[PDB]
Ligand binder design. Sequence first.
Ligand SMILES: Nc1cccc(F)c1C(=O)OP(=O)(O)OC[C@H]1O[C@@H](n2cnc3c(N)ncnc32)[C@H](O)[C@@H]1O
Length: 394
Amino acid sequence: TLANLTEVLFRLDFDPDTAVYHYRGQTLSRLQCRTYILSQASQLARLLKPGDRVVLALNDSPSLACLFLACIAVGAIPAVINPKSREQALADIAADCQASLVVREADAPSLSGPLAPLTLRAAAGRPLLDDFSLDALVGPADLDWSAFHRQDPAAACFLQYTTGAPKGVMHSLRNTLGFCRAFATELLALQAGDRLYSIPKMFFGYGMGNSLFFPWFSGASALLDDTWPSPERVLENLVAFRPRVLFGVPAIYASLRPQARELLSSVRLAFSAGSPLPRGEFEFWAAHGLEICDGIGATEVGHVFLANRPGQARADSTGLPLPGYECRLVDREGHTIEEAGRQGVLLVRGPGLSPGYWRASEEQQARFAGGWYRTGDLFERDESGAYRHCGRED
Ligand SMILES: Nc1cccc(F)c1C(=O)OP(=O)(O)OC[C@H]1O[C@@H](n2cnc3c(N)ncnc32)[C@H](O)[C@@H]1O
């Protein structure tokens, strides 16, 4: 059945009066955001035809997340990238996906070059909701817009760009719901009302799931912060927001050690991704009564696909494949490794798997060969089935 991801999220059975995003000491409800998204969608539909690409070079904010979903609502294909990207990096990405539109921070330069996109800027003053000058460009919004562009659930509806010539990972309605269900429901069992805080930003796939999607998907809420996460800023946000679920990385947990007491006041579920969690970090927080759950995700797989399960986490370990995912280890001749304590390259398939790169040579697309994503990570398995990272392929 033809569907639209934003519409599907809006139909999930959660109280429309509960928080969905927090920003600068303010709170926006699901109903407030839906109302704004549809209004903004009414304007974007005047500017973009179905399928047109859009690059958002913005700091984390409710307007970013909503604008992202408004693009999808009208059938556009958005991508969220570092707002402090070098000018050439932003052009290389916008060229790769042939963007029609780029939305940037206030005072940002215009994009140039062959077929350069239209550049619109956010408003100064960091308002809770931003029209990104759409009011002046296409006029005010419709009042009761609902003209969702519905497409095959397997089709691309947004992109994720992770040193080389940039590549765009396609994500579809189907595999996006796939990686949310596996991680937010089956692994973490997030609850309605759960206050989430992801330190990695939404231009990182990890952060896009944590902050953008999971609030809608599970009825939870996420703190959004448009300033860079220094330990000083992270702690103040911890004290003001008191999240129940923290999404961090190993160095973040290392830097939070001198503030263990403040974190323990609210955080009941601590997650780490991006790189291996050292045993030393796992045990320091265990001594303070905090379990840190290490899991691996990759842009090409949507989110975390192999992780320590809450309440059963172990030091120096990446845990188990999430439900629905299958993991395989291959030796240097492409043969599947069955033994434990024998390292090989990790391949994965499952609900979160991307259908491919937006624009790529056949060699690049070969990373998805055979229905598996080749992580390029060396892994070994132990007798319990749990995986441990062993380096990179060569
Ligand atoms: N997109 C994401 C969504 C959710 C969570 C994420 F981590 C990402 C992400 O890290 O995505 P990414 O930029 O594509 O990097 C993917 C690459 O990071 C490395 N890695 C990620 N977690 C790791 C871990 N816990 N232990 C060891 N190595 C790890 C590895 O080498 C992998 O292949």
